[PDB]
Amino acid sequence: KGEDVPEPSVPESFRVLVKELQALALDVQTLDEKDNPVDIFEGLASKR
Amino acid sequence: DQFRVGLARLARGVRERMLMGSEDSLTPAKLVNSRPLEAAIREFFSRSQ
Amino acid sequence: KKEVRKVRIALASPEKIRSWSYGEVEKPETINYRTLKPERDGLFDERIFGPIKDYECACGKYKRQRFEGKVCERCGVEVTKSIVRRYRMGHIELATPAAHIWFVKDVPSKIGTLLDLSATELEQVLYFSKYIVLDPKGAILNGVPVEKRQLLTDEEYRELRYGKQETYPLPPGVDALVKDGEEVVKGQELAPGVVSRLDGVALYRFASILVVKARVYPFEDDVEVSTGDRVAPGDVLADGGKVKSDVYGRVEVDLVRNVVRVVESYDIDARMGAEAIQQLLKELDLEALEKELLEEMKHPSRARRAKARKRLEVVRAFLDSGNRPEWMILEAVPVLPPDLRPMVQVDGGRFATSDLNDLYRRLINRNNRLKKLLAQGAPEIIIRNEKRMLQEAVDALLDNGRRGAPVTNPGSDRPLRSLTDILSGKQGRFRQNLLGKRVDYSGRSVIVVGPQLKLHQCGLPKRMALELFKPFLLKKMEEKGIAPNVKAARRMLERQRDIKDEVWDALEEVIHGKVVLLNRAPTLHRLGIQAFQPVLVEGQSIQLHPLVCEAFNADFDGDQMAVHVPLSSFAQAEARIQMLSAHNLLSPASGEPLAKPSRDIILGLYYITQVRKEKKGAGLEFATPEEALAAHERGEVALNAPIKVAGRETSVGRLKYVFANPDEALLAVAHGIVDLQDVVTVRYMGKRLETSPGRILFARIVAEAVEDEKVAWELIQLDVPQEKNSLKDLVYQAFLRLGMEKTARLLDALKYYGFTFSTTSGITIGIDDAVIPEEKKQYLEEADRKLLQIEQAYEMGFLTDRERYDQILQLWTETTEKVTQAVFKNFEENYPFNPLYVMAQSGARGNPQQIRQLCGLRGLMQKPSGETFEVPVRSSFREGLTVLEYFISSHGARKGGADTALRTADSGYLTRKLVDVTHEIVVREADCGTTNYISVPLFQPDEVTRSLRLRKRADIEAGLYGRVLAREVEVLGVRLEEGRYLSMDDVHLLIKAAEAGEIQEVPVRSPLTCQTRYGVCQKCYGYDLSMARPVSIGEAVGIVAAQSIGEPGTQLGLPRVIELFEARRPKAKAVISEIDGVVRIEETEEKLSVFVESEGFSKEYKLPKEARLLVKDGDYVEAGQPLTRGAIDPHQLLEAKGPEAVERYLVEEIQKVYRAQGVKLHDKHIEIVVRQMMKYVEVTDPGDSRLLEGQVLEKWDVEALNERLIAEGKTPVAWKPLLMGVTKSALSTKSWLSAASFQNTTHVLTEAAIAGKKDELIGLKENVILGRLIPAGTGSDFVRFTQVVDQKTLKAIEEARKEAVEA
DNA sequence: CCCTGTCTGGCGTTCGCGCGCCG
RNA sequence: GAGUCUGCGGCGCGCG
DNA sequence: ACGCCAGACAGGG
Ligand SMILES: [Mg+2]
Ligand SMILES: [Zn+2]
Ligand SMILES: [Zn+2]
Secondary structure: OOOOOOOOOOOHHHHHHHHHHHHOOOEEEEEOOOOOEOOOOOOOOOOO | OHHHHHHHHHHHHHHHHHHHOOOOOOOHHHHOOOHHHHHHHHHHHHHOO | OOOOOEEEEEOOOHHHHHHOEEEEOOOOOOEOOOOOOEOOOOOOOOOOOOOOOOOOOOOOOOOOOOOOOOOOOOOOOOOOOOHHHHHOEEEEEEEEEEEOHHHHOOOOOHHHHHOOOOOOHHHHHHHHOOOEEEOOOOOOOOOOOOOOOOEEOHHHHHHHHOOOOEEEEOOOOOOOOOOOOOEEOOOOOOOOOOOOOOOEEOEEEOOEEEEOOEEEEEOOOOEOOOOOOEEOOOOEEEOHHHEEOOOOEEEEEEOOOOEEEEEOOOOOOEEEOHHHHHHHHHOOOHHHHHHHHHHHHHOOOHHHHHHHHHOHHHHHHHHHHOOOHHHHEEEEEEEOOOOOOOEEEOOOOOEEEOOHHHHHHHHHHHHHHHHHHHHHOOOHHHHHHHHHHHHHHHHHHHOOOOOOOOEOOOOOOOEOOOHHHHHOOOOOOHHHHHOOOOOOOEEEEEEEEOOOOOOOEEEOEHHHHHHHOHHHHHHHHHHOOOOOOHHHHHHHHOOHHHOOHHHHHHHHHHOOOOOEEEEOOOOOOHHHEEEEEEOOEOOOOEEEOOHHHOOOOOOOOOOEEEEEOOOOHHHHHHHHHOOEOOOOOEOOOOOOEOOOOOHHHHHHHHHHHOOOOOOOOOOOOOOOOOHHHHHHHHHHHOOOOOOOOOOOOOOHHHHHOEEOOHHHHHHHHHOOOOOOOOOOEEEOOOOEEOOOHHHHHHHHHHHHHOOOHHHHHHOOOOOOOOOHHHHHHHHHHHHHHHOHHHHHHHHHHHHHHHHHHHHHHOOOOOOOOOOOOOOHHHHHHHHHHHHHHHHHHHOOOOOOHHHHHHHHHHHHHHHHHHHHHHHHHHHHHOOOOOHHHHHHHOOOOOOHHHHHHHOOOOOOOEOOOOOEOOOOOOOOOOOOOOHHHHHHHHHHHHHHHHHHHHHHHHHHHHHHHHHHHHOOOOOOOOOOOOOOOEEOOOEEOOOOOOOOEEOOHHHHHHHHOOOEEOOOEEOOOOEEOOOOEOOOOHHHHHHHHHHHOOOOOOEEOOHHHOOOOOOOOHHHHOOOOOOOOOOOOOOOHHHHHHHHHHOHHHHOOHHHHHHHHOOOOOOOOOOEOOOOEEEEOOOOOOOEEEEEEOOOOEEEEEEOOOOOOOOOOOOEEOOOOEOOOOOOOHHHHHHHHOHHHHHHHHHHHHHHHHHOOOOOOOHHHHHHHHHHHOOEEEEEEOOOOOOOOEEEHHHHHHHHHHHHOOOOOOOOOEEEEOOOOHHHHHHOOOOOOOOOOOOOHHHHHHHHHHOOEEEEOOOOOHHHHOOOOOOOOOOOOOOOOOOOOOHHHHHHHHHHHHOOOOO
């Protein structure tokens, strides 16, 4: 198009890593300004 | 060396069939199985470092 | 849509295992061959993990994107691509618990330390083998009251539940000596042969007697109790409240004897193994043990209090962060996604699946078989035997190898890659993220010199470009008439014979002002990658500029360089502004240029500027007679006086020719009157200068490169042949004086002429060119005969077997060095212009030791071990190096090659470790106000016992160049202000002053004393950006430092540097004086002794036989002073002389090695690093948290600052400076992400989990993994926000403000 | 019961690129 | 109004 | 094979 590239979405290696780590008892959660949630997996993790 | 590693593997299973074969007719197939020797030798000429 | 600013590892709640979970994998069914579809509920079922297909469902009720977020009414399939299949998780519900191997086998057993059990052996004892525990209450005895938390066995537990049951068989036809339910005591004969072993009630079996620790209460009317129920003293049993029990216990209503026996054992709750630890873990009230430990900690002696302190941190971290410790036990195993571990079709029908599945099967199978083995009937031995295998299985998926190594059946004795394996190591998962390994717009080919090219550009193969800038080209095709659309333009290019010449026009046009990055094999420093303007060229090879060949270690025997392309208009910006070649001329290590003319350039630029000398046989005195002018000018015309004679004022060569204007001089050259290397007279701007044409020509080239002709002679020396150094210094000067890009112009200028002059010069190696000194024959014979004297001196018995050897070595060691200066002496006096020689003298190519091996002789080559050979290598390479001398010399070459191989690995590793600790260090500031500076010494103590000396020019320069004075210093007349950055010239001043004797030290800001916790400021770092002005805020200094140290290392030696970055106890230790008084020595036989003493006390220093002490009986010895000779132990020196001493020790002692090897790196760097070695300290007087603790220095400065300043109550937080090595500081830092990268991913995470650790992302390592923007650089909070304006939009916005006035 | 010492237990070991082979 | 799926781990050697 | 760090236990007062 000759346009300006969008701004990066989370890299799959990270996503692949969090779950790898989730495979292990450990729970890796990303957090916000005040320690609260944020979502790396855009919407496939919430259930149903 | 590998040929004798394979001979042991064959001799391993052949001893199991000394007990498996009902009566005397057990010389041919009751004692020999070419599976080990093949995998062993083969393994050496295509996979050995 | 928010930004991920903090990541956090926390333990998993079983409920959370279920929460992230989709379905439960309950059967070992991979995929059934007939249909490559997921078998049943199994490991790959799509419910549990996700849509096997695109957007479509199961059966196909809904098949596109319109209803993307809804599930099929009849079948539950929500869909995105099959990615929802690769991100979802499934869980397996284990039968009886098992524990994480990550928490149980880490050196410090997180559960062993928390739970006071034998840290490593009691665990392994009951975890994998057989021992059981009692939960709330169990009123009856074993001998003692109920064990609230202790553990019992199945046999003594068995006995308890049915009373005291022990069955006693009786031989057929034999009658017993007791009645059906008679009270039997321990030792009583229950029959002739049988004898009871315990008290209780003898019950009849059909054949056998079963005694029971119990009482027996007969009843006439019906029973109110039932077999199995528990009873206490009082509890009714039968006949109404008439028959009551008297003891706690189980019940057995025997209606065969119409009686109710109450076996001694009542309500007893019981369970063992992971089961036993799950119980204990649940019953602990962390608060209580916390308090308990507090007391234990500060009150008893150091043995049990020290244990309580290491036992209090874990309890702490749990309560503190929140996420409680009962989840350390596994009862729900999370199943990694399906797509992650590939079930793929290989060849002919072969299928490959990630080994993880084999281990998952293992666990599933065992858990199931266990479920079945407990429901069928449970014989103890077989239950444990399985729980064991079970427990081992659980390890397998988590971590294989900690304990034994599982293998796929006979095929490959290979450990199935366990989850730990996937997350750790060199090529692991944590390493794949951090280094992010494969670019989309990349390329690589063989490089080839591009002489005409300017540092600004690089020759890139058009064919390479076409693919590289393909999408950018496609669009441009459409902008023009070559192609209708993108897909069109693509097909147009899918074949090589289809490219219209018009496409090249388009590409040539698309790369117009864009630039690409080039990479070299090992990326040692920031210049390991540089940006250039691609100038499309034909062929395979990539044209690289010669001057940059120095930055990337690259010659042209086949080295290949990679190529990337900046996609964003932002990336391109930075890439061409701050990453291009021509703007990064100086090196980040030293303020010396890196665009120095290389070997080829210098050879050319040298040749042209040298003066020749020829023959003086007749008088050389024109200085005085006028008849000397005439006579020696006619004598020259004759054959007697040369054109370049040693004739003080002017050799006839100057008398004959005088040149007015500058040009005048070179025309005569071109006409064959004067060689360029000849000595003539010339009239310049205001002087009659006596200098050779060549020298004058060089003057012009520079003067032309940069038009400010006067400023060109101000910074050049035409009084000597241009050496790599004279040139090196001309670049540097030119950089400071005239400006960056103008310098770049000068470089290419020299580059161009150096190269041209080079070809014309005709310098070439010839066999005869290597010239052997006539003195070689002498020195060898002279030393030969002397060797006989040494032999005759031993054949008599005067010299010891050793003395003989050491003396002979010294004969050659000197004789060889003798031939060395001899050869050069020959070239200097007789062949000034020898091909081999000139190359070596000119910064070009050659090494004094090398030349020797060709014309002189390469004499001593050591044996395999190291002991040098007694016989030397009498030959040169000019003449036949003989058969054996070759072999003999071979041994050394081989050790050299092996050495180079192991140094390369260790050089990259050192760069890894330096980065592991200094990556976070970045410049983000405001002049940090804490003025605590470092003083750069200019003089050194002991070379010779004690004599003060001026440190080397080099060394001192290394210490004060481009630094920021801490305080004002009035030296030789000038007033060096505070905060001023001393230029090289300024550091030339201070040395000249110390010469006079006005200054011994220099107050200067340094990273060693910065206040900025995470980071370093502008005034503290200093000058050296790649540019010569002060450091710009937002420069990754940590790395830049780590790199400048890791490159030179490959030249080192290194073993010491390691001992130094890593606080260690070197080979030859030197006892440091912990006390400062004076010294004194003793004479007794065995051991000597150096004592630092006072009439009050002495610090006894045991100095064995081999140790050489140089402090003598008599004078003073400050704390941490060398009392022995050699290396020192940082820890002791820290204790004795203090931290300000360790830091400065480390620094100087590290520089010692590179100095001695030619490397010239600025102290700044080793400081950055060493600082981090000490970013931690121990605590001795608590406030917030308990005493023994190793925490971040500055985080205490925070604590103490607000505890005394903002909130009252001066609870002084007394700490102790702690010294740690680069490696341990990285291992143990704040964030875990960084730590997960090197040490042990296994440990790092364990702890970080336990204590819900919130990784506040600061530093470039941790924040790179996330693929998030770098906290340093443009992500620099200083410049991440900066807007631009046009006076036109400035007025328009003001018009927006004006419209704000209502009505 | 304390401090000191000794074997003991766990981890780590440049970078990039080619080619070719194998379940 | 094109986009899927394959190339992994290791081994050996060779260049830089 | 090695090297290094950190560890848990056992011996001599
Ligand atoms: Mg090369
Ligand atoms: Zn459906
Ligand atoms: Zn500072």
